[PDB]
């Protein structure tokens, strides 16, 4: 009889994560991402209007402008943006 929570498949990004369209929404330090369509607390230009094919919905980690890895602005006024707590798929190899 099982005594461990059902296995969870980790999310991971390929390449630099420009193709990432998963649901992860937490930064490397555990902070909660700000929604892309929100301008509070941080104003920015990474909007779905300006990156219409980048999947900039909700507050999911994304890489619309092809930086090093998926990222987000955070909801904390003291922290503008962070890379997300996401590993590269190739790490498990």
Structural notes for this entry:
By secondary structure, the chain is low in regular secondary structure. It has a single domain, classed as Plasminogen Kringle 4 (Beta Barrel), CATH 2.40.20. It contains no helices and 4 strands. The protein has strands spanning 12-13, 71-73, 81-83, 87-88. β2 and β3 form a beta hairpin. It starts with 11 loop residues before the first strand and ends in a 5-residue tail after the last strand. 24% of the residues are buried.
Distance between the termini: 30 Å
CATH architecture: Beta Barrel
Within the CATH hierarchy, at the fold level, what is the topology? Answer: Plasminogen Kringle 4
- Under CATH, the homologous superfamily reads Plasminogen Kringle 4
Main sheet record? 2 strands, parallel
What would you call the structural class? little secondary structure
Gyration radius (Cα, Å) is 14 Å
State which percent range the strand residues make up.
Answer: 5-15%
The shape is globular
Q: Classify the helix fraction into a percent range.
A: under 10%
SS element count, helices: 0
Secondary-structure element order, as H and E?
A: EEEE
Q: Biggest sheet, strands in spatial order?
A: 1-4
Please, how many domains?
1
CATH class bucket? Mainly Beta
Number of strand elements: 4
Function: Apo(a) is the main constituent of lipoprotein(a) (Lp(a)). It has serine proteinase activity and is able of autoproteolysis. Inhibits tissue-type plasminogen activator 1. Lp(a) may be a ligand for megalin/Gp 330.
Domain Kringle: 11-89
Family: Belongs to the peptidase S1 family. Plasminogen subfamily.
Disulfide bonds: 12-89, 33-72, 61-84
């Amino acid at each position: 009889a099982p005594t461990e929570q059902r296995p969870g498949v980790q999310e991971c990004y390929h390449g630099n994560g420009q193709s990432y369209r998963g649901t992860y929404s937490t930064t490397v330090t555990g902070r909660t991402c700000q929604a892309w369509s929100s301008m509070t607390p941080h104003s920015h230009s990474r909007t779905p209007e300006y990156y219409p094919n980048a999947g900039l919905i909700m507050n999911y980690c994304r890489n619309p402008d092809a930086v090093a890895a998926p990222y987000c602005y955070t909801r904390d006024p003291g922290v503008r943006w962070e890379y997300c707590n996401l590993t590269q798929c190739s790490d498990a190899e």
